[PDB]
Design a protein around this ligand. Structure first.
Ligand code: FAD
Ligand code: FAD
Lengths: 465, 465
């Protein structure tokens, strides 16, 4: 394990109050929210500056001590978990918002800033930080950038990658690469920024970043739509895109089952008079007061084309929140319904109906009575493809089929040109599957860059590659 | 020079009709239209497939023959020019449009596809390819991605980088990295795509790419605005951004002098009743017919705030084209007015007024009577900062001060946090200056990545780093 000498020296760098070794305090860092993996660590460091992160890395690199960068600890692939006596480097104390430029429309923040607080400050100066996500209350900017987080609004605003203008990164050997910048155009050499975004802390530690700010929309309009098939929803998407372009900030495809779960278990209101096999939750966000006219125009063309069967446009803020509460509570609504085998994948937008149809048939053939629970962002091709246990089956016995379900789901994903990890990343969970599916040259380069940036293998080893 | 043996072997790969060695034929590849540099080469190859590009690279790598990738040959920093007997690898024959997916909104094209033809193909299927430059008719996709080209509408659509979904690249050692993808979400390993975008052919040869398609706007409105200062133009931008958001497709800042040249030397109509020291050419694009109301609302806030002095909204297509012709012809209208020291830089949007003010003063201090000709994309901070000679001065004596003007211009850029190369890139011209201004660690990594991807130094050597 880690020697007293090294513990003492790391402790001195950050101050003993910010150097945890007591198992009761370590408990919050060695495990995560979903209880997927349970790791072990002899030390958690909570540095308060890049200077301290540098001191930490130089020592770790010299003593061959493995480090695991961690932000909000909401990652779902064991990327931020110390599985093998590694020292955790939490960035929660580096949470300062350094500068907000409303003319350049930028915001500079430390890695540990909580996504929700950045959104709040953006809002306080009549601006929007559009990266909206599920774990907003506790996930951090450093985490968002390292995993390349993306949300429901991705179709309009892009991913974390699209939000970044600059980053400050400390490497394994202690060097600092400061590429903080407020520039929208800058073609001065290779793009190193994007290499760390999505790196899951395997190439270095992000200590700060400069992000884009956007205009705050003046009008937001929402609607629930009842349709017969995912294919009809895809035609509606075509209409929405052509009629709203950048103002279309949500287009969610929800199957009857997930909606039914949210209604019966999360105390939510069924939005339409009758039940439909498929639903779409559509939202428009505009700088002018013309969002409702666009929505109505989209719904009109959909009625005319016979793809929309019924629709309910929200008439108040309470009713909008009611619509979203239903969507946001699908996840927890699954728990009382039994075992759930979860997968977050993506395919070309055109291939979403094929994916659903193909996955469903394969999954039900594997486990008769299994209940697919699909819902997602049809506009960026990311579907949460979950399967709930057959009514009355044993939970433990059903969850044991996870891997068998993965094989089947991934074969459909791969034949459709999709991705085995759309948002969450690779970390430790999908490390093996990455080597099997990724382009051979691409994978060789990743290993070569890893070896170059972390020759001694102390920067979050055993993850991604 | 290059041996007959090797010339014969390269010739055999592509076929002798696509292997040029006659000096009259080489002339078009060893020099660019703006006579900045004049190189030399013993051979130009025009391969017709990725397989041939692989064959060329393997042979070049074995024999240690340097290669210079080239597309449209419109780059302005000497990147595509062979300065040392290198073999030119033109991609002009690989110009196939492979697939147009209007549901996924993607388009897969070969590296040699002319930008303008891609724009036209997108239009044929009621879609838009928003990347738009001045060399459109000659520049290729491979060129655009390699230089990370951007243009007038960057503030709304982004740069070439923002257009890219996947790329196919051939490395110096012949390996093919196929990252062609239609996926909008894919967190599967490191982002290698963006490493090559902006690499200027120094890290491999891009042979194909998957790009995004956008909705075709239904309405386009344009106005020419007269203001008293760049600072007032910046306040107007804030108003335009808040009121139009993503529908603001052009916000140009034009000083009186360039507008004066365009009117007097390009036969363009002066768009306003009186003359103003500063002008803004603003354009809005919308999927609905609400563009004119947004523009009129923008200009109304401008008049009320006292920042807009006069404004003319184009009332016909002929009038819109008249406005754009004036702006697009500022570049050639400088020629008859004497020597022109040109710089294409960027600073944070908030700093544009400070940059213009500071650069003008320093340039006039350097060369009394020199006439600054500044114009550009205020929304992304990219100013074409050119200086025309003093009236009556000697053209040669003036152009001899290019370097002196650069020292001064860059000092203003660097103190404001800007870039010495906003669009064109580094290539050979700014290779030494990059090493002086870029972050020290960043430059170390670029050299290590270069050494890793091109160990024998055959991939466009002596450029970028
Ligand atoms: C309820 C819930 C909803 C979620 N919804 C979404 C969603 O909608 N979209 C989505 O993309 N994800 C979602 N996630 C997962 C998402 O990846 C994480 O929530 C988030 O991106 C990680 O942020 P974090 O601060 O928790 O990072 P952590 O969990 O601490 O770390 C995640 C990875 O980033 C690395 N890392 C963290 N900080 C740094 C740093 N500063 N420098 C270098 N590496 C670092 C870690 O080493 C690890 O590899 C959700 C998770 C939960 C529990
Ligand atoms: C009149 C005029 C207006 C211009 N306006 C703009 C503008 O508004 N915005 C802007 O950004 N630029 C502008 N440019 C310059 C711009 O960079 C080029 O026009 C364009 O991006 C290069 O395309 P190309 O096909 O001609 O590439 P080339 O000039 O042939 O090559 C440029 C660089 O890319 C590399 N390269 C080319 N093809 C490949 C390949 N497939 N694989 C790997 N490397 C490759 C070359 O080695 C070289 O380093 C302008 C140029 C002119 C003459």
């Amino acid at each position: 394990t880690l020697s007293p000498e090294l513990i003492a020296r790391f402790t001195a760098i950050v101050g003993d109050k910010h150097a945890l070794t007591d198992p009761l305090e370590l408990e919050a860092y060695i495990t995560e929210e979903r209880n997927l993996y349970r790791g072990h660590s002899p030390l958690v460091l909570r540095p308060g500056s890049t200077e301290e992160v540098v001191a930490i890395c130089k020592l770790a690199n010299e003593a061959r001590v493995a480090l695991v960068p961690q932000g909000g600890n909401t990652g779902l692939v064991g990327g931020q978990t110390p599985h093998n006596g590694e020292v955790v480097i939490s960035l929660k104390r580096m949470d300062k918002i350094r500068e907000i430029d409303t003319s350049s429309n930028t915001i500079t923040v430390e890695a540990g800033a909580i996504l929700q607080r950045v959104q709040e400050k953006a809002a306080e100066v009549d601006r929007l930080f559009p990266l909206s996500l599920g774990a907003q209350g506790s996930c951090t900017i450093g985490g968002n950038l390292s995993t390349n987080a993306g949300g429901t609004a991705a179709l309009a605003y892009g991913l974390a990658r699209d939000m970044a203008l600059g980053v400050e990164v400390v490497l394994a050997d202690g060097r600092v690469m400061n590429l903080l910048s407020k520039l929208k155009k800058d073609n001065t050499g290779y793009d190193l920024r994007d290499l760390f975004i999505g790196a899951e802390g395997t190439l270095g530690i992000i200590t700060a970043a400069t992000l884009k700010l956007f205009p705050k929309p003046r009008a937001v309009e929402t609607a629930f739509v009842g349709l017969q098939s995912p294919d009809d929803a895809l035609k509606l998407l075509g209409i929405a895109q052509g009629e709203a372009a950048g103002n279309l900030t949500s287009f969610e495809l929800i199957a009857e089952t997930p909606l039914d779960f949210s209604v019966r278990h999360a105390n939510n209101r069924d939005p339409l008079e009758a039940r439909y096999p498929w639903y779409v939750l559509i939202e428009l966000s505009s700088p002018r007061d013309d969002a409702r006219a666009a929505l109505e125009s989209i719904l009109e063309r959909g009625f005319e084309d016979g793809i929309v069967v019924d629709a309910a446009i929200a008439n108040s803020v309470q009713q909008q929140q009611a619509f979203w509460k239903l969507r946001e509570e699908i996840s927890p609504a699954q728990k009382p319904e039994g075992g759930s085998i979860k997968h977050d994948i993506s395919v070309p937008v055109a291939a979403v109906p094929q994916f659903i149809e193909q996955a469903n048939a394969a999954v039900v053939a594997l486990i008769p009575g299994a209940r697919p629970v699909p819902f997602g962002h049809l506009g960026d091709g990311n579907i949460h493809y979950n399967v709930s246990q057959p009514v009355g089956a044993d939970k433990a016995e059903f969850l044991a089929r996870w891997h068998d379900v993965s094989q089947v789901v991934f074969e459909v994903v791969l034949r459709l040109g999709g991705s085995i990890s759309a948002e969450h990343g690779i970390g430790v969970m999908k490390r093996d599957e990455l080597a099997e599916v990724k382009d051979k040259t691409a994978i060789e380069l990743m290993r070569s860059i890893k070896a170059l940036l972390d020759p001694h293998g102390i920067m979050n080893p055993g993850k991604v590659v």
